[PDB]
Each structure stands twice: as structure tokens, then as C-alpha cells.
Amino acid sequence: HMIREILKMGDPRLLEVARPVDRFDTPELHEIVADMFETMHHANGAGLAAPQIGIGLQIIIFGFPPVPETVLINPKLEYMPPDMEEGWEGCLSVPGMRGVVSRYAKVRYSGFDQFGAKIDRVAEGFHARVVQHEYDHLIGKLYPMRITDFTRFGFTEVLFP
Ligand SMILES: CCCCC[C@H](CC(=O)NO)C(=O)N[C@H](C(=O)N1CCC[C@H]1CO)C(C)C
Ligand SMILES: [Fe+2]
């Protein structure tokens, strides 16, 4: 549909807590989802959250072990301790950088698609990492807030030439 501007870290809209979607299968919600996919694809992103395009709603999309192409609305996550994994992340809202972030190796997630149909899955590894990363956007968190080792945070061009 249309490519929307991705907000950058420092924008206070990225720090807010997103509100739930109350009505499903509306033209307005279908446009949002279409806008998010075009904006995501345009950036070669593996996920996107509505607050990143300035829409303060609990909507995430992802899909790039194939990660299934998914619209997840009003997500509920369950973290599965104690197995954590470190890995490199970047964010379309933190352009130019990468940092190592510890994530749960496995999570459960549920919610609804844009039609209101239920979604309910257990995810592992990169799939689970993407879901955690996008969920964080809905609660005001960007991945530098999760970093504990800032010697492993820097510019992509320097870390991975
Ligand atoms: C990895 C967990 C985060 C996934 C989502 C982000 C996109 C984003 O900002 N979503 O909110 C992404 O695709 N990031 C990519 C990313 O971090 N990648 C791409 C695959 C490997 C990894 C970098 O090591 C690039 C495009 C910056
Ligand atoms: Fe992000």
C-alpha cells in the first residue's frame, strides 16, 4: 500500500505502552497491516511493530527454520525460563547499529490476526527472538534497554564489515 516513516530512538512515541485493538476486520485495520508489511519489506526487516510507524496499537507483524508470515494483534507472551540465548539484534528504529541481547530461547504467544481469528503458538530460537523484540516495542522497550554488555554494542559497518 504505502511506505510509512519508521520512527527513530529518541522519539517519545517509541516509549509509550501501546493500546489494545478493539475492533477486528475493519478497512482501517487492513490498511495499517498493509502499510506495515510494505514498510517492513522496504527495509528488509524480519518484523515490525505499529508504534514504529507512529501507531500506538498492539499490532506486530513478522515473517522472514522459516518464520511464518504472521499478523499478531493484542499479543500475550509467556516466557519459558530458564534457558536464555545471546544473539545479535538490530532495529529499524536504531539504524546503523547492532548489539548482543539475551532472550528466552522459547516463548509461547497468543493473540488474534486482523480478522479476529485466534493465534496460539510456541516458538523457539530466532522465531522466539523476533517475537520478543517486537513485543518489547509494544511495551515501550527498545533493545539497548535490554543490553547488559555494552562492549558488544556498536555500528554494523564496524562490527560486521
Ligand atoms: C533479530 C531480532 C529483531 C528482528 C526485527 C528487526 C526489525 C525491527 O526493528 N523490528 O521491530 C530486524 O529485522 N532486524 C534485523 C536483524 O537484527 N537481523 C537480520 C537477521 C540477523 C539479525 C542481525 O544479526 C536487521 C534488518 C537490522
Ligand atoms: Fe525493532
Side-chain angles (χ1 to χ4, degrees), residues 3 5-18 20-27 29-30 32-43 45-63 65-161:
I3 299 174
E5 178 204 348
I6 303 171
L7 300 186
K8 299 193 187 77
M9 179 162 199
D11 193 307
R13 291 173 287 178
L14 294 171
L15 304 174
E16 295 168 5
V17 175
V21 172
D22 296 320
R23 299 174 56 80
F24 296 93
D25 200 359
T26 69
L29 180 63
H30 285 303
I32 295 177
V33 166
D35 285 350
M36 291 181 62
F37 272 107
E38 282 302 326
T39 298
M40 187 183 81
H41 289 156
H42 187 64
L48 196 68
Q52 297 180 275
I53 62 170
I55 295 189
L57 298 177
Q58 299 174 23
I59 305 165
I60 63 174
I61 70 174
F62 49 94
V67 182
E69 205 170 346
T70 304
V71 172
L72 190 64
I73 298 172
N74 301 341
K76 301 210 186 317
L77 256 65
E78 305 174 354
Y79 303 141
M80 297 169 62
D83 295 352
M84 320 299 287
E85 306 183 350
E86 298 192 308
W88 290 100
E89 306 191 9
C91 187
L92 291 176
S93 295
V94 187
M97 312 196 76
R98 303 288 190 264
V100 166
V101 184
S102 173
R103 298 286 187 189
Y104 287 94
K106 286 179 86 160
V107 298
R108 187 214 161 192
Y109 59 91
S110 62
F112 303 87
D113 68 15
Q114 63 275 44
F115 295 89
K118 159 139 239 210
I119 291 165
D120 186 0
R121 299 168 179 168
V122 174
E124 212 170 6
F126 183 74
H127 180 181
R129 176 172 299 268
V130 175
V131 170
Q132 287 169 77
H133 179 110
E134 305 303 336
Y135 179 68
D136 275 0
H137 277 300
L138 306 190
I139 54 173
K141 297 182 180 314
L142 318 162
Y143 78 86
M145 303 177 193
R146 310 280 201 174
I147 292 182
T148 63
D149 179 18
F150 271 95
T151 71
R152 286 195 286 179
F153 171 70
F155 291 89
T156 316
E157 57 170 78
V158 172
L159 296 159
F160 313 93

